[PDB]
Write a protein that binds this DNA or RNA. Structure first.
Lengths: 98, 99
DNA sequence: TGCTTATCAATTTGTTGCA
DNA sequence: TGCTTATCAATTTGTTGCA
């Protein structure tokens, strides 16, 4: 399972009866549109209805974890504050199973 | 700040690639067909810019008596049963867009 | 009448912030 | 975690203004 993006390019290119090079071409630009938008603190909604959003994640300190299998305490490095791209589904995405 | 809708996204894509807006949509519409066919056939699928689609099941939740603080209304929720729902997940190629 | 009405209004149904 | 959360957002459906 788990159809990859390269398989998706081919899957779409075959259905539309078009070269896969154009398929990646159109998608590569869409990618740039998204990145440049989020870099300018915009919100974007893309097919099939996914909304892109810049958001702030508050810093999290360190805390030493433990591994059950290897039995060695494993420290996680404290994660400072940073921005993260948050996506969330919208109307047609859930409707896809109707 | 304004928000880019998928319609004005088609036009941004259509101008940047120097192609008709109709073909830009004919491909995203096709992408919508493929994605849906996969989920209804219980298969994950990753799309650009690196979003993964998984169909998952949610567990039922009962009713609860709410209260709208603007109204003063005590309002009622309808208990929501078990059902299917698709979940997405931001693969890290998407977080790298802020690099 | 009937609208790509209209920083609509009233509505149910997720999603986020913070104590 | 869950709210008598938020002047939230994102849906869905009803009413009005204006040509």
């Amino acid at each position: 399972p788990t159809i990859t993006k390269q398989e998706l390019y081919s899957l779409v290119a075959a259905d539309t009866q078009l070269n896969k090079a154009l398929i990646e071409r159109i998608f590569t630009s869409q990618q740039k549109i998204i990145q440049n938008a989020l870099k300018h603190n915009q919100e974007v909604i893309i097919p099939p209805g996914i909304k892109f959003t810049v958001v702030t994640v508050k810093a999290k300190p360190a805390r030493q974890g433990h591994n059950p299998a290897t039995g060695e305490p494993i420290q996680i490095k404290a994660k400072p504050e940073h921005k993260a791209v948050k996506i969330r589904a919208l109307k047609p995405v859930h409707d896809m199973l109707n």
